[PDB]
């Protein structure tokens, strides 16, 4: 009898394994994967603590909001080289980029010349225009909404932007920063940026993340269906 006795058993084992594998795949395709990025001291820890439910290098945070499972990946200790492991995150649903609004008037404290806002701009420009991230959406969080308001009445925004021309208030100045950050995008036809002004006392950030992720998923499905 061809393919009998132990061989048959072996085949059976393989089949069983295959079944389990398929199951796992069906379980792993229902999770929204987000990549958390920040310039540094940008108030991302508060973001993690906000939507917190349920080693070194990678840090994983699982939570659920309205029958939707989110897995957030944080790379803070990975300081070796971005070019050598960034492509691992090619299939993420979205990139949550955190920027602090209170570091415009304060220097990097190192090199005596780097400005934290300019460093954040450089990081955002590098991440947004990347060969691995061409259709991945970015959710931009602007933290420190209170320190910015408290400091804008004393330190003019021209310290960071020599070409700024306008009033000096909380409004008409955060819009300038948001526009400056959004103008770094060069693929507006295929990519979207969702900007939210996050406050340290605001619990509505999870709602914004959920809305942006649902929009991204719906648009991806429509593109697949040919509408798209």
């Amino acid at each position: 009898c061809t393919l009998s006795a132990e061989d048959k058993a072996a085949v059976e084992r393989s089949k069983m394994i295959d079944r389990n594998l398929r199951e796992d795949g069906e379980k792993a395709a229902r999770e929204v994967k987000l990549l958390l990025l920040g310039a540094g001291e940008s108030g991302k820890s508060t973001i993690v603590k906000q939507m917190k439910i349920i080693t070194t290098g990678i840090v994983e945070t699982h939570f659920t909001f309205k029958d939707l499972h989110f897995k957030m990946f944080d790379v803070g200790a990975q300081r070796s080289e971005r070019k050598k492991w960034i492509h691992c995150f090619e299939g993420v649903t979205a990139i949550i980029f955190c920027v602090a609004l209170s570091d415009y008037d304060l220097v990097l404290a190192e090199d005596e010349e780097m400005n934290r806002m300019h460093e954040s701009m450089k990081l955002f420009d590098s991440i947004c225009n990347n060969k691995w991230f061409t259709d991945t959406s970015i959710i931009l969080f602007l933290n420190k909404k209170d320190l910015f308001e408290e400091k804008i009445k004393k330190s003019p925004l021209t310290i960071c932007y020599p070409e700024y021309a306008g009033s000096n208030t909380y409004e008409e100045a955060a819009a300038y920063i948001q526009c400056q950050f959004e103008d770094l995008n060069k693929r507006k036809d295929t990519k979207e940026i969702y900007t939210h002004f996050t406050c340290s006392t605001d619990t509505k950030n999870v709602q914004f993340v959920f809305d942006a992720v649902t929009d991204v998923i719906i648009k991806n499905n429509l593109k697949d269906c040919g509408l798209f």
Binding site: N20, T56, G57, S80, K84, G91
Partner: protein
């Protein structure tokens, strides 16, 4: 003093360069110009392995020459039987970001690692996580077994380490490199090993003493792969500048450069044959090039992958060649 040390190492570098040049009386191409070319190498896919649901990042054969191990970035480590398609094992990982894979020479253990900076050792003849080594401060790039109780790893913190699985401690640390170490290879006698880093450099380390022996340069970019010649007296390196290079140990210099036009992609892996005549290298164009190691002539081409070639291996008996790819398919060529 700054002057008593600085500006003085350059003198030693100049002396080393002069010594290397003084012994380059001829070239390998001149010696091999009177050798019959191999001809045309034609290999056709014989087995296709399916089951991975994401990119395949590493693979290893094992001295059995029949069983194979593969790792993919979906949290699974699959052990196949090559002669058929049957899966022998499927180990679920605690971390989905894997970059390396190893098969113990005895076939009793397996190793894994990745972005979590931890090397996990699983026992097969018990399936069950046997050990977890965590000393590094960067992503694991490679890991190769020496015995059932010894392992050598390299991390992205510009460091390599020889461990002791019995106690879980770090037996020895190899320092002196500058960039992220991306690959390493063990000599057939397991007394020395070569490591290539992102600083366009390769180094020869002696396991028993933990001291650098020789340093090889010449590449114009990061080095992604490395392989020892079957006789143990030379090795080959592939870098991001779309070129491969052969270095020798006794002469302590470069011998030949395998490069060609219409090739502008980096090399992801390299490997030799049972006799060393051929040199197989996988590229980012989802293909593999087979070069004549003694003539620097492209003897053959292997095509059939869709996204990329990330892992490449040759069995201990030279029967077939296994290639993995970013489309989650492993192919056997004969």
């Amino acid at each position: 003093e700054l002057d008593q040390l600085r500006q003085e190492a350059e003198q030693l570098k100049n002396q080393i360069r002069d010594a290397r040049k003084a012994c380059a009386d001829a070239t390998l191409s001149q010696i091999t110009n009177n050798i019959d070319p191999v001809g045309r190498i034609q290999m056709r896919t014989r087995r296709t392995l399916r089951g991975h649901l994401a990119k395949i990042y590493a693979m290893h054969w094992g001295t059995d020459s029949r069983l194979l191990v593969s790792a993919s970035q979906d949290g699974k480590l699959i052990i196949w039987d090559s002669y058929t398609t049957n899966k022998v094992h499927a180990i679920p990982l605690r971390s989905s970001w894997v970059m390396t894979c190893a098969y113990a020479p005895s076939g009793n253990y397996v190793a894994c690692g990745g972005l979590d900076n931890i090397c996990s050792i699983y026992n097969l003849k018990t399936v069950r996580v046997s050990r977890e080594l965590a000393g590094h401060t960067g992503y694991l790039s490679c890991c190769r077994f020496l015995d059932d109780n010894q392992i050598v790893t390299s991390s992205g913190d510009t460091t390599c380490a020889l461990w002791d699985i019995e106690t879980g401690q770090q037996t020895t640390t190899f320092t002196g490199h500058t960039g992220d170490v991306m690959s390493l290879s063990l000599a057939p006698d397991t007394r020395l090993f070569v490591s290539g880093a992102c600083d366009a450099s390769a180094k020869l380390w002696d396991v028993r003493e933990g001291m650098c022996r020789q340093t090889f340069t010449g590449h114009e970019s990061d080095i992604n792969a490395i392989c020892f010649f079957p006789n143990g007296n030379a090795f080959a390196t592939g870098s991001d500048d779309a070129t491969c290079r052969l270095f020798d140990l006794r002469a302590d210099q470069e011998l030949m450069t395998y490069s060609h036009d219409n090739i502008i992609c980096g090399i992801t892996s390299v490997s030799f044959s049972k006799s060393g005549r051929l040199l197989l290298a996988g590229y980012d164009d989802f293909n593999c090039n087979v070069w004549d190691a003694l003539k620097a002539d492209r003897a053959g081409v292997l095509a059939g992958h869709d996204n990329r070639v990330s892992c490449l291996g040759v069995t201990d008996d030279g029967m077939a060649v296994a290639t993995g790819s970013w489309d989650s398919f492993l192919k056997i060529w004969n």
